[PDB]
Design an enzyme around this catalytic site. Structure first.
Site, mmCIF file in Angstrom:
data_model
loop_
_atom_site.group_PDB
_atom_site.id
_atom_site.type_symbol
_atom_site.label_atom_id
_atom_site.label_comp_id
_atom_site.label_asym_id
_atom_site.label_seq_id
_atom_site.Cartn_x
_atom_site.Cartn_y
_atom_site.Cartn_z
ATOM 1 N N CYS A 149 11.419 -5.343 -6.079
ATOM 2 C CA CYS A 149 10.025 -5.265 -5.554
ATOM 3 C C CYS A 149 10.126 -6.611 -4.516
ATOM 4 N N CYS A 154 8.793 -2.987 -2.807
ATOM 5 C CA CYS A 154 7.306 -3.045 -2.350
ATOM 6 C C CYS A 154 6.843 -4.097 -1.695
ATOM 7 N N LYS A 157 8.702 -3.461 2.178
ATOM 8 C CA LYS A 157 8.188 -2.254 2.668
ATOM 9 C C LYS A 157 6.755 -2.115 2.928
ATOM 10 N N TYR A 291 9.097 9.129 -2.503
ATOM 11 C CA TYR A 291 8.399 8.127 -1.725
ATOM 12 C C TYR A 291 8.819 7.006 -0.792
ATOM 13 N N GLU A 295 8.372 6.742 3.001
ATOM 14 C CA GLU A 295 7.636 5.465 3.394
ATOM 15 C C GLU A 295 8.319 4.819 4.630
ATOM 16 N N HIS A 566 -22.140 2.593 1.291
ATOM 17 C CA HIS A 566 -21.904 3.009 2.572
ATOM 18 C C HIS A 566 -21.981 1.862 3.637
ATOM 19 N N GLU A 571 -16.819 6.353 -0.872
ATOM 20 C CA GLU A 571 -17.991 6.791 -1.472
ATOM 21 C C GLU A 571 -17.861 8.345 -1.484
HETATM 22 C C1 LIG Z 1 11.876 0.788 -1.555
HETATM 23 C C2 LIG Z 1 11.244 0.487 -2.803
HETATM 24 C C3 LIG Z 1 9.778 0.701 -2.681
HETATM 25 C C4 LIG Z 1 9.132 0.160 -3.837
HETATM 26 N N1 LIG Z 1 7.566 0.413 -3.398
HETATM 27 C C5 LIG Z 1 6.966 0.015 -4.926
HETATM 28 C C6 LIG Z 1 5.446 -0.165 -4.840
HETATM 29 O O1 LIG Z 1 4.846 -0.146 -3.618
HETATM 30 N N2 LIG Z 1 4.834 -0.605 -5.712
HETATM 31 C C7 LIG Z 1 5.355 -0.421 -7.054
HETATM 32 O O2 LIG Z 1 4.373 -0.625 -8.029
HETATM 33 N N3 LIG Z 1 6.764 -0.450 -7.167
HETATM 34 C C8 LIG Z 1 7.482 -0.160 -6.121
HETATM 35 N N4 LIG Z 1 8.724 0.074 -6.382
HETATM 36 C C9 LIG Z 1 9.352 -0.157 -7.793
HETATM 37 C C10 LIG Z 1 9.589 -1.485 -8.180
HETATM 38 O O3 LIG Z 1 10.470 -2.089 -7.120
HETATM 39 C C11 LIG Z 1 10.361 -1.439 -9.283
HETATM 40 O O4 LIG Z 1 9.556 -0.529 -10.243
HETATM 41 C C12 LIG Z 1 10.354 -2.808 -9.938
HETATM 42 O O5 LIG Z 1 11.109 -3.683 -9.208
HETATM 43 C C13 LIG Z 1 11.152 -2.505 -11.304
HETATM 44 O O6 LIG Z 1 11.325 -3.860 -11.833
HETATM 45 P P1 LIG Z 1 12.577 -4.034 -13.018
HETATM 46 O O7 LIG Z 1 12.096 -5.569 -13.567
HETATM 47 O O8 LIG Z 1 12.608 -3.033 -14.101
HETATM 48 O O9 LIG Z 1 13.830 -4.317 -12.216
HETATM 49 P P2 LIG Z 1 14.146 -5.126 -10.689
HETATM 50 O O10 LIG Z 1 12.968 -5.653 -10.150
HETATM 51 O O11 LIG Z 1 15.006 -4.151 -10.084
HETATM 52 O O12 LIG Z 1 15.013 -6.264 -11.626
HETATM 53 C C14 LIG Z 1 16.326 -6.137 -11.945
HETATM 54 C C15 LIG Z 1 17.142 -7.353 -11.815
HETATM 55 O O13 LIG Z 1 18.155 -7.608 -12.617
HETATM 56 C C16 LIG Z 1 19.534 -7.778 -11.775
HETATM 57 N N5 LIG Z 1 20.407 -7.542 -12.621
HETATM 58 C C17 LIG Z 1 21.265 -6.264 -12.921
HETATM 59 N N6 LIG Z 1 22.124 -6.191 -13.655
HETATM 60 C C18 LIG Z 1 22.012 -7.503 -14.077
HETATM 61 C C19 LIG Z 1 23.209 -8.224 -14.809
HETATM 62 N N7 LIG Z 1 24.191 -7.514 -15.658
HETATM 63 N N8 LIG Z 1 22.971 -9.248 -15.163
HETATM 64 C C20 LIG Z 1 21.955 -10.031 -14.561
HETATM 65 N N9 LIG Z 1 21.138 -9.771 -13.853
HETATM 66 C C21 LIG Z 1 21.291 -8.185 -13.454
HETATM 67 C C22 LIG Z 1 19.083 -7.001 -10.589
HETATM 68 O O14 LIG Z 1 20.082 -7.407 -9.557
HETATM 69 C C23 LIG Z 1 17.733 -7.369 -10.367
HETATM 70 O O15 LIG Z 1 17.681 -8.513 -9.804
HETATM 71 C C24 LIG Z 1 9.523 0.384 -5.111
HETATM 72 C C25 LIG Z 1 10.822 0.386 -5.174
HETATM 73 C C26 LIG Z 1 11.708 0.365 -4.169
HETATM 74 C C27 LIG Z 1 13.405 0.612 -4.241
HETATM 75 C C1 LIG Z 2 -28.871 -3.429 10.609
HETATM 76 C C2 LIG Z 2 -29.099 -2.740 9.158
HETATM 77 C C3 LIG Z 2 -27.718 -2.493 8.750
HETATM 78 C C4 LIG Z 2 -27.851 -1.781 7.546
HETATM 79 N N1 LIG Z 2 -26.657 -1.683 6.815
HETATM 80 C C5 LIG Z 2 -26.516 -0.773 5.903
HETATM 81 C C6 LIG Z 2 -25.143 -0.523 5.052
HETATM 82 O O1 LIG Z 2 -24.263 -0.922 5.635
HETATM 83 N N2 LIG Z 2 -25.492 0.163 4.171
HETATM 84 C C7 LIG Z 2 -26.365 0.818 3.546
HETATM 85 O O2 LIG Z 2 -26.196 1.143 2.461
HETATM 86 N N3 LIG Z 2 -27.798 0.489 3.973
HETATM 87 C C8 LIG Z 2 -27.807 -0.258 5.142
HETATM 88 N N4 LIG Z 2 -28.728 -0.400 5.823
HETATM 89 C C9 LIG Z 2 -30.173 -0.030 4.920
HETATM 90 C C10 LIG Z 2 -30.258 1.764 5.423
HETATM 91 O O3 LIG Z 2 -30.364 1.736 6.903
HETATM 92 C C11 LIG Z 2 -31.549 1.848 4.821
HETATM 93 O O4 LIG Z 2 -31.590 1.565 3.464
HETATM 94 C C12 LIG Z 2 -32.036 3.493 5.293
HETATM 95 O O5 LIG Z 2 -31.824 3.921 6.340
HETATM 96 C C13 LIG Z 2 -33.288 3.991 4.450
HETATM 97 O O6 LIG Z 2 -33.394 5.167 4.725
HETATM 98 P P1 LIG Z 2 -34.988 5.641 4.585
HETATM 99 O O7 LIG Z 2 -34.952 7.197 4.564
HETATM 100 O O8 LIG Z 2 -35.742 4.947 3.655
HETATM 101 O O9 LIG Z 2 -35.643 5.412 6.062
HETATM 102 P P2 LIG Z 2 -35.202 5.192 7.630
HETATM 103 O O10 LIG Z 2 -33.762 5.490 7.675
HETATM 104 O O11 LIG Z 2 -35.595 4.025 8.133
HETATM 105 O O12 LIG Z 2 -35.986 6.545 8.143
HETATM 106 C C14 LIG Z 2 -37.474 6.436 8.514
HETATM 107 C C15 LIG Z 2 -37.781 7.439 9.355
HETATM 108 O O13 LIG Z 2 -39.085 7.560 9.490
HETATM 109 C C16 LIG Z 2 -39.667 7.353 10.830
HETATM 110 N N5 LIG Z 2 -41.165 7.358 10.667
HETATM 111 C C17 LIG Z 2 -41.824 6.191 10.519
HETATM 112 N N6 LIG Z 2 -43.031 6.504 10.559
HETATM 113 C C18 LIG Z 2 -43.233 7.749 10.731
HETATM 114 C C19 LIG Z 2 -44.327 8.662 10.851
HETATM 115 N N7 LIG Z 2 -45.442 8.066 10.734
HETATM 116 N N8 LIG Z 2 -43.948 9.852 11.263
HETATM 117 C C20 LIG Z 2 -42.876 10.370 11.528
HETATM 118 N N9 LIG Z 2 -41.592 9.661 11.323
HETATM 119 C C21 LIG Z 2 -41.954 8.324 10.938
HETATM 120 C C22 LIG Z 2 -38.839 6.427 11.321
HETATM 121 O O14 LIG Z 2 -38.958 5.986 12.687
HETATM 122 C C23 LIG Z 2 -37.396 6.812 10.793
HETATM 123 O O15 LIG Z 2 -36.820 7.513 11.939
HETATM 124 C C24 LIG Z 2 -28.977 -1.194 6.960
HETATM 125 C C25 LIG Z 2 -30.197 -1.620 7.886
HETATM 126 C C26 LIG Z 2 -30.158 -2.178 8.558
HETATM 127 C C27 LIG Z 2 -31.483 -2.531 9.555
#
Ligand SMILES: Cc1cc2nc3c(=O)[nH]c(=O)nc-3n(C[C@H](O)[C@H](O)[C@H](O)COP(=O)(O)OP(=O)(O)OC[C@H]3O[C@@H](n4cnc5c(N)ncnc54)[C@H](O)[C@@H]3O)c2cc1C
Ligand SMILES: Cc1cc2nc3c(=O)[nH]c(=O)nc-3n(C[C@H](O)[C@H](O)[C@H](O)COP(=O)(O)OP(=O)(O)OC[C@H]3O[C@@H](n4cnc5c(N)ncnc54)[C@H](O)[C@@H]3O)c2cc1C
Ligand SMILES: [Mg+2]
Ligand SMILES: [Mg+2]
Ligand SMILES: [Mg+2]
Lengths: 588, 588
Positions: A149, A154, A157, A291, A295, A566, A571
């Site tokens: 790895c 891992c 890569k 994979y 990858e 959101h 979500e």
């Molecule tokens: C290209 C690639 C991408 C991968 N990507 C991911 C990923 O994104 N996520 C993930 O979870 N896993 C990933 N894996 C898998 C992960 O690398 C292995 O599951 C993990 O390294 C296994 O660990 P290990 O301890 O079993 O063996 P290894 O990490 O292979 O270690 C064994 C070690 O023992 C040494 N050795 C061997 N024989 C002897 C000996 N006789 N005496 C002494 N030392 C010896 C080896 O040379 C090596 O250094 C990937 C693998 C590859 C090939």
């Molecule tokens: C800058 C900002 C960033 C935000 N970011 C997030 C976020 O990342 N994630 C998240 O989950 N929430 C976020 N929120 C909160 C989210 O926007 C509110 O929780 C959500 O919009 C509330 O929905 P609501 O239906 O209660 O009201 P609103 O969406 O405000 O709708 C009420 C509507 O009724 C209208 N209205 C009012 N009075 C009247 C009336 N008398 N007659 C007719 N229509 C009327 C209004 O003009 C409006 O169009 C953010 C809010 C702000 C201000």
């Protein structure tokens, strides 16, 4: 149960103290051991429900029922007054170091699992050796401590995947108002490899420092288990010697396979070579459809390369095939060519690699399709990604008695024990287990705690989540849809699904209905989630937290009652409603 | 409570059919209603556990105990032969359209909650009107259908956050080998606003199409509830009329507050104006310290702006204050200036906004610090982010009897009912509820199902996860550490924590120990996770899945037994081990 556990714990622990958190005599012994730099496990009997029973059972070894009680390698050493006597007389160091074997633990392999096991064992006072040796690839590539790895898996890569993702970030940046022109920007492979390799080098060094700081002996030597307690080591100068260990952990991992065709070993490369390659591969053929294959093909195409993938049968065998098709379709729409139903027959060299001008060579690849039609095309680099294999014939003498399966992997109990009682195996060589880094790490850490600290917790290998880091990432936890239908029957499976579009893709003018998720559920079990699948950006970040819920037995109702965050991609799992049975379109 | 449930369901539903999935007579009735374009709720009695008791209790209305049975607005209509008699005689359409009121449902407010409620109700045959009107801001800004999140909230803010994040992607790309030079790339505010506004326009149009396709009447008119069933509407030409509705949903949301200081309304702006502003704000002062204040200051700085935030007391009041401090420290290290412990006294105009040449004006802001020192600085734009308020005095006549709290929000039961029994309130005006888009949507959809489809499921407002989209994002689910300690006592709280470094930040030379996560846990309840907190990239994607596990009662052991996905940020939650009580450093 209790007496059997205690006997096993006492026999296996290197240094262990039976204690109570309220007792001042126990605190005094702990303080002495800390001053003496003696590491040990501690069992606090007042923190266990069966502590009173354990106290009674301790007399079977020590003839006393009180705390503290110190043991070294199965032998009762003393209560408070006795341990203080040994300390006062400068006898304690010799006592705690006395051992039938050179080491309490020898780990063969310094990769994900082996380093985790060795560091964890050392925390409880186990005298530990970690052996690691990297046999060079056919072209001579080798690397430092840390395993697959860290060096050739891992870590590099995913860094190359990130370099590829940044191509699209540059494109998107224009739509978000930035003044750059993606069409005038190019990528420098060597600069990227230098940065990746500098990070890998920091990891190699960090592991050596970590072993030193944990008092683990690191031997850069090839190990061979020649009897249950004897490991033959061959060092960098070809000097051969034998060290002995009480417990042995086999953690030697796997290496890439090559097809048995002319020119493959001579002229192709594998992932082992790719991550340090000094020149850009150029026009590349990837043979395989794992994979690893996809990858690597994906990031090479995103960096600007001309890439073809040769697929014998299907993509991502073993993964949900609807998801696999979507992964491949995205790659094909984004520059990757596929030679489908095709295998190689021979690799011929047209140009030798130019090491001085830092350029690849040129190869002629001959192959054929399943209908017999011929494939013949030139490539600068050919990468084989046709599976990985353990190489235990050189790790293990057959006379030791460690059973291997038909693929050469170690047959292990649910606590990692081989057919030889003191020998354990972890990581990719443990037959039947998911071959993933965090699995190897958990297995090694948990095993070390059972051996040396009296722990009982096993590693749970079920429902381990995965992510394939293709250009559009694919995260999964649990069963594929086809495996769920096979196990339970179509009538008992309900699949909820939806397309989605990341908000970040709107202003960027990216695809409306490519990202996709589904929940595969069992109707007769409260609509239990059997499998979760997501194709989209940051799919590993999306998937990870759901793996906890699935571990806990999440149902569809649990997803429904949870409120979304959101705006996120994740979500869309909280509001799924379209079933496959309904035939209603999943598009949004 | 079957009798009480059936009575409530029949009394409230617009059109409802009681059926069984195993009945070809019901199939015929469903087909007839579908052919007649008559939408309705359906309750399949064979799918419910108390279906037998419902069949018996239906006879209290229909004198029959067989299926199918059809009801309209409280009245039994007939069985299979009878519904077909009405259909054959062209009587059925008149029967299903007969109503004492103009509408079964009037939704006042066409935002997140109101559109969700109106669309859902129409699915069950409720004749529905959605009223939406956007009162312009002081400078005249207005926008289309969809509410705050669509037009002036989550959607544009996250798109501008993404534009800001792309600044760092451009920088990172150099280290990953791309040939661009971040120092010669600039940002064009107007280009980004044009793209954001084009996407918003597609949402405004999509909601209008969605209402049309669901047979919902959309009135772009201001609504005022003048009696329990009467809504006075004022249209775009100031024409005043009255429509009547059986059920009323108040979903009118909130608008930004201004401080009561000279010049604030005249010369400052709020988030309502920012997201469509035709000129770059230029040198900007953000007054306030809410998530809105910090999100806007953050993206403005990342785009290259000179930005200052003026903080009365603390950042992110109501959020975990350790996390708030880390959020603010990251912003301060990445270009945001903070005027701490400071309030404004007056905004003076120095130059008028130049609409023709598309340039901001110039303002003098005078204020003072808690230590008595004066604040005096010039800014091109001043943005007030000092909270939001409902404006129900114009929505509701006091004589109707809908009780409001001291803040002007509606006092509701756990099923969204106001003190007037046919009037409900959802979204930001529902007192005490999390003010978030997915909460409003769930509340509205679930309420519509209870009113018109006999559903009983309530919205669960507990442990609703959040994400603050600051330059380094902050995701949370559950209690802050300080709230957990207040509720349970310090001795019953254990906090596991760690820094982490995204793998993507290694080659990019970003910070080692700024990303941070913790689990706040209750010792005496099996180490139950009370709160989860993460500061890092993609924090909403990280947090979402864990919200399902927390809903299900996850403990620390559930996190421990789940395996990580590598390499991800999220996997750090699966291996946490450092407690705050231990004093051991959380650094990598
Ligand atoms: C290209 C690639 C991408 C991968 N990507 C991911 C990923 O994104 N996520 C993930 O979870 N896993 C990933 N894996 C898998 C992960 O690398 C292995 O599951 C993990 O390294 C296994 O660990 P290990 O301890 O079993 O063996 P290894 O990490 O292979 O270690 C064994 C070690 O023992 C040494 N050795 C061997 N024989 C002897 C000996 N006789 N005496 C002494 N030392 C010896 C080896 O040379 C090596 O250094 C990937 C693998 C590859 C090939
Ligand atoms: C800058 C900002 C960033 C935000 N970011 C997030 C976020 O990342 N994630 C998240 O989950 N929430 C976020 N929120 C909160 C989210 O926007 C509110 O929780 C959500 O919009 C509330 O929905 P609501 O239906 O209660 O009201 P609103 O969406 O405000 O709708 C009420 C509507 O009724 C209208 N209205 C009012 N009075 C009247 C009336 N008398 N007659 C007719 N229509 C009327 C209004 O003009 C409006 O169009 C953010 C809010 C702000 C201000
Ligand atoms: Mg560098
Ligand atoms: Mg499967
Ligand atoms: Mg555009």
């Amino acid at each position: 149960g209790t007496s059997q556990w205690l006997r096993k714990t006492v026999d296996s622990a290197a240094v262990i103290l039976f204690s109570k958190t309220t007792c001042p005599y126990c605190k005094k012994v702990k303080d002495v051991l800390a001053e003496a730099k003696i590491k040990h496990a501690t069992i606090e009997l007042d923190q266990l429900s069966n502590g009173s029973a354990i106290q009674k059972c301790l007399a079977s070894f020590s003839k006393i029922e009180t705390v503290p009680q110190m043991f070294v390698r199965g032998k009762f050493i003393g209560d408070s007054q006795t341990v203080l006597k040994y300390y006062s007389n400068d006898e304690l160091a010799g006592i705690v170091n006395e051992s039938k074997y050179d080491y309490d633990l020898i780990v063969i392999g310094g990769g994900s699992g082996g380093l985790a096991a060795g560091k964890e064992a050392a925390k409880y006072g186990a005298k530990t050796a970690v052996l690691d040796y990297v046999e060079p690839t056919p072209i001579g590539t080798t690397w430092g401590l840390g395993g697959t790895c860290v060096n050739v898996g891992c870590i590099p890569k995913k860094l190359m995947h990130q370099a590829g993702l940044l191509s699209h970030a540059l494109e998107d940046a224009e739509h978000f108002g930035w003044s750059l022109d993606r069409s005038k920007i190019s990528h420098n492979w060597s600069t990227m490899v230098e940065g990746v390799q500098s990070h890998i080098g920091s990891l190699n060094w960090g592991y050596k420092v970590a072993l030193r700081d944990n008092q683990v002996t690191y031997l850069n030597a090839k190990g061979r288990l020649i009897s249950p307690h004897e490991v033959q080591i061959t060092d960098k100068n070809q000097k051969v010697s034998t060290i002995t260990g009480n417990k042995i952990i086999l953690a030697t991992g796997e290496r890439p396979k090559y097809p048995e065709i002319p020119g493959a070993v001579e002229y192709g490369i594998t992932s082992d070579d790719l991550f340090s390659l000094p020149y850009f591969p150029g026009k590349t053929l990837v043979i395989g459809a794992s994979y690893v294959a996809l990858e690597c093909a994906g990031f090479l195409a995103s960096l600007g390369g001309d890439v073809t993938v040769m697929v014998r049968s299907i993509l991502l065998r073993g993964f949900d095939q609807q998801m696999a098709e979507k992964v491949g379709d995205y790659m094909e729409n984004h520059g990757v060519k596929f030679a489908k139903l095709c295998v190689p027959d021979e690799i011929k060299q047209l140009k030798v690699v130019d090491t001085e001008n830092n350029k690849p060579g040129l190869l002629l690849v001959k192959g054929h399709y399943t209908d017999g039609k011929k494939f013949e095309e030139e490539f600068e680099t050919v990468i084989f990604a046709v599976g990985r294999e353990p190489q235990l014939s050189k790790v293990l003498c057959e006379t030791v008695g460690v059973k291997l399966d038909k693929n050469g992997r170690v047959v292990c109990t649910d606590d990692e024990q081989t057919t030889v009682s003191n020998v354990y195996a972890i990581g990719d060589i443990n037959a039947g287990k998911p071959q993933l880094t965090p699995v190897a790490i958990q297995a090694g850490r948990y095993l070390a705690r059972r051996l040396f600290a009296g722990a009982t917790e096993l590693t749970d290998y079920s429902n381990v989540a995965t992510t394939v880091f293709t250009p559009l990432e694919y995260g999964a936890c649990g069963l594929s849809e086809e495996d769920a239908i096979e196990k339970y029957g179509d009538k008992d499976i309900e699949v909820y699904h939806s397309n989605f579009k990341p908000l970040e893709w709107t202003v960027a003018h990216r695809e409306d209905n490519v990202c996709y998720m589904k929940l595969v559920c069992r109707k007769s079990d409260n609509m239990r989630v059997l499998g979760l699948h997501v194709l989209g950006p940051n799919a590993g970040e999306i998937t990870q937290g759901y793996a906890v819920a699935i571990k806990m037995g999440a149902t569809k109702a649990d997803f429904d009652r949870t409120i979304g965050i959101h705006p996120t991609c994740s979500e869309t799992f909280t509001t799924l409603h379209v079933t496959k049975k309904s035939g209603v379109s999943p598009i949004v």
